[PDB]
Design a protein around this ligand. Sequence first.
Ligand SMILES: [Mg+2]
Length: 249
Amino acid sequence: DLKGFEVSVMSWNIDGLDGRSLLTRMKAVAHIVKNVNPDILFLQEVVDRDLAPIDKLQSLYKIYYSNKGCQYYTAILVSKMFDVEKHDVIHFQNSGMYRTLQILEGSIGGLKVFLLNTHLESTREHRPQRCAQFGFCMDKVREIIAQNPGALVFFGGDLNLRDEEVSRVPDGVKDAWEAAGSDNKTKFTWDTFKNDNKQGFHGAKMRFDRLYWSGPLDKVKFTLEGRQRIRSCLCFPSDHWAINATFFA
Ligand SMILES: [Mg+2]
């Protein structure tokens, strides 16, 4: 049965586009990953420069990059026990920012698993593109679910959402943070009040980073990670907190 079955999914925009203290920050990212030790890890805004500390995680994970060599891209890292069946990268047709829906399909044990990682169009101005992408992603999730009854499906990443932007979420698909209890202490994943990696914002807080799921696991625990300043350079690993969700029966 699925009782005692448990899988953890972590997602993090690692702010690779910010060149300041990039190597130290990527080392910190890899450090935090090894300590949280998630089964599955989604990354966004990964860059080629100073990727080594991340790439070195291949001793612990299989690493799939959405579009390596592009200005920035996403990654999905899975346990070496994850049996990969397909890796598909869908380029959003309406994107001016090389954004993609990265899909890794496989299984761990006997359980079919679909992993969908994205970084939706950025900024208030691109609401049109972003809302269309989200809808498109949900349609894809709806289809995967229909085609694979009994599968675990995880969809998320940096969705850049304001709540009023969330559209057609299928019944059966739940938001991990909400299902864990809509805890205020774990709500905002991009918090310019507390995160000072970026200047010029003036106290904006958003729940940009989210994880949705469908499947035979009905309970979820949800925490934030990467919230500690790096001592040597006095910055956070990223201007985003990581989200960390543990799904169980
Ligand atoms: Mg950035």
